[PDB]
Design a protein around this ligand. Structure first.
Ligand SMILES: [Zn+2]
Ligand SMILES: [Zn+2]
Ligand SMILES: [Zn+2]
Ligand SMILES: [Zn+2]
Length: 119
DNA sequence: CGCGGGGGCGTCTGCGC
DNA sequence: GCGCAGACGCCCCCGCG
């Protein structure tokens, strides 16, 4: 509390005080995904928790699909969609079922969740 | 039924304050 | 030195031919 002082944070609803440099550094990373933003479009008022979410959201208004498939030339707006679509050519289906009479595999976690819902 | 496409979220890395 | 942002990865949910 004098010369020697603890670490602090500035984000809402946090403790705003930490005791370990790296523990606080890691803590700071947590809030980078919680920083409040709003849509920057001409006719929107939605909110986001990060620049990346807001930037992604802008793609829905702007039609910006820069992630073009090297094979299909199909333009996507997200890397996770492109990498997911990529597995279509890569035969990469790691999400195998665990039912007592199945071993069918999917390339998406939610596709496996869906499979189980139809099992 | 396989896959497109948007939401929210954690996170390493890099940059800027 | 820390904080924020930019960018990568996934889960989750919905809709379509
Ligand atoms: Zn904090
Ligand atoms: Zn918007
Ligand atoms: Zn393709
Ligand atoms: Zn199964």
């Amino acid at each position: 509390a004098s010369e020697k002082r603890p670490f602090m944070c500035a984000y809402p609803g946090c403790n705003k005080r930490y005791f370990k440099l790296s523990h606080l550094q890691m803590h700071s990373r947590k809030h980078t995904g919680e920083k409040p933003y709003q849509c920057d479009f001409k006719d929107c008022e939605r909110r986001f928790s990060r620049s990346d979410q807001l930037k992604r959201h802008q793609r829905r208004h702007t039609g910006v699909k820069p992630f073009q498939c090297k094979t299909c030339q199909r333009k996507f707006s997200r890397s996770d969609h492109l990498k997911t679509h990529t597995r279509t050519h890569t035969g990469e289906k790691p999400f195998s079922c665990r039912w007592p009479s199945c071993q069918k595999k999917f390339a998406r976690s939610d596709e496996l969740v869906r499979h189980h819902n139809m099992h």
